[PDB]
Amino acid sequence: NAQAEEFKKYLETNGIKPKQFHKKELIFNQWDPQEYCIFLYDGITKLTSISENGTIMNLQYYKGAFVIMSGFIDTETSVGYYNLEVISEQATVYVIKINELKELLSKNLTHFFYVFQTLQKQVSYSLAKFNDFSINGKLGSICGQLLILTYVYGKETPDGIKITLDNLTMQELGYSSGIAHSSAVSRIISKLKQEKVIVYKNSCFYVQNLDYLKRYAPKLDEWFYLACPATWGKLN
Amino acid sequence: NAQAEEFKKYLETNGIKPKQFHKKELIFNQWDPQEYCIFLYDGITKLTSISENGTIMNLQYYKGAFVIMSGFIDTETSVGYYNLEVISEQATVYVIKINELKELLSKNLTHFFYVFQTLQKQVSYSLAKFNDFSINGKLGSICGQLLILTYVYGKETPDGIKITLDNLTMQELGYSSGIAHSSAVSRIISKLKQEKVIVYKNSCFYVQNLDYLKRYAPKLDEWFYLACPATWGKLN
DNA sequence: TTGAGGCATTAACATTTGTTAACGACGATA
DNA sequence: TATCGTCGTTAACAAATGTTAATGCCTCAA
């Protein structure tokens, strides 16, 4: 919040202007690999990839402020062919070309650490998500994904913890957990309603047994405690 | 590697001298969190985590030279509770306190960008691995892990590509794929031998149909092409 | 009001994977 | 030489997941 806003000012004082994106349009994509250093300031986006069969995969979400790399800082080559779709109504972004990045960082040292810090946050997040999505099959994958959603998009209400997210269909949850068919996702969420872990109200998800999700995503809950401890405190 | 040698001479100049670990040792562990910056210079290691009920998870392997870190750079707090076990007969490691690192990379930038490069390699590697493991179930996870081990520990032989890796049991393949029982991995392997994809010789695996593994792990093959071009080029 | 499309739910069937046990090969020990 | 433990293989069964289709609820357009 603070270390990021300080980074914003350093960008405006170097000619980097914020380019605002609206919902559903792709900042970068997998078919036109262009190496940038996206600095999502305010907004919500999802990193996706489309197989050759047209199969969709949602790798993760990004809520500003955060940094996303589409190319390497040295070789200036692509880190992978992915898409960064905007899913919030409006999201402002400070896009930076990979070339000038190496220069802007070598000047200010405190902001080099910031980008380096967020990259470490990225690594720990991927290992934890990988650890919990592999042990308990797809039930644990849905539980882990839901746990992630509750922490960064959750708010406490008398009905439970409301996950403030439009859309969030059965199809979209399946993409974030590697489930291709919507019927399979529903079959699992119908078990979580039976178990009394979640309820479906207002086309919106309320979780009531957060501990049940921790048992299926202990490494992810461990990550929020160590990486985003403020987000962890709101629910503990 | 050149960058890893300049870095190695940079550490030896500032008083950091190597340490020798033997097989089965743990550089760090998940029960005594110490925040180091591990510069694995020569040797092979696997990052693991033990769940509270005792199930092992093999997150990935590390082959020197590379950079692993158990704590964040600015806060110096743990990034996660993992074990780094030495699986080669011996390994040469340069342990450096997390605080000393901030000053060292502050003096010399070309080594700061080298550490940043290795981290970008880590991010894109985790996203790619998470992509191919989540889409095709356990068959696609075993196929993905084998693809990783061929590019890194594979060599052209008359019987295909030999995975030059010792003590690669069925358990260790399962731990890397979230499979808990060696019976399940043997079942998947007997099918890959049936389809003439691999052969089991002298407790080692020989890969004879690399293209079969690419169709089940396309983004990992893409990652080796974009991140480790030299390693990839030796098998195409 | 009627009718089209998308989403959620459930059903059923097929395939895969989880789980445990038995068999046989191999090494190592005394 | 006999005996013990480790590992791979296969089998059998239960459970989970992949796949398809049918149904009902809801929105929207005319």
Residue numbers in the entry:
A (entry chain A), B (entry chain B): 2 to 237
Please, what does the article write about this entry?
In addition, we found three new PrfA mutants in the remaining three strains—Leu to His substitution at residue 140 (PrfAL140H), Ala to Gly substitution at residue 218 (PrfAA218G), and Ala to Val substitution at residue 94 (PrfAA94V). The results were consistent with the fosfomycin sensitivity test—all the prfA mutant strains showed significantly increased hpt expression compared to the wild-type strain, with the A94V substitution having a minute increase in hpt expression. Hence, the new mutant structures display features characteristic of both the inactive and active forms of PrfA. It is noteworthy that we did not manage to get crystals of the PrfAWT under these crystallization conditions; however, crystals of PrfAA94V, which showed almost PrfAWT activity levels, were obtained. The PrfAA94V protein also had one folded HTH and one unfolded (WT) motif identical to that of the PrfA* mutants.
PrfAWT is a homodimer in which each monomer consists of an N-terminal domain (residues 1 to 108) and a C-terminal DNA-binding domain (residues 138 to 237) linked by a long α-helix (αC, residues 109 to 137). Two α-helices in the C-terminal domain, αE (residues 170 to 178) and αF (residues 183 to 197), constitute the two helices of the typical HTH motif present in many prokaryotic transcription factors. Glutathione binding stabilizes the DNA-binding helix-turn-helix (HTH) motif in a conformation compatible with DNA-binding, thereby allowing expression of PrfA-regulated virulence factors.
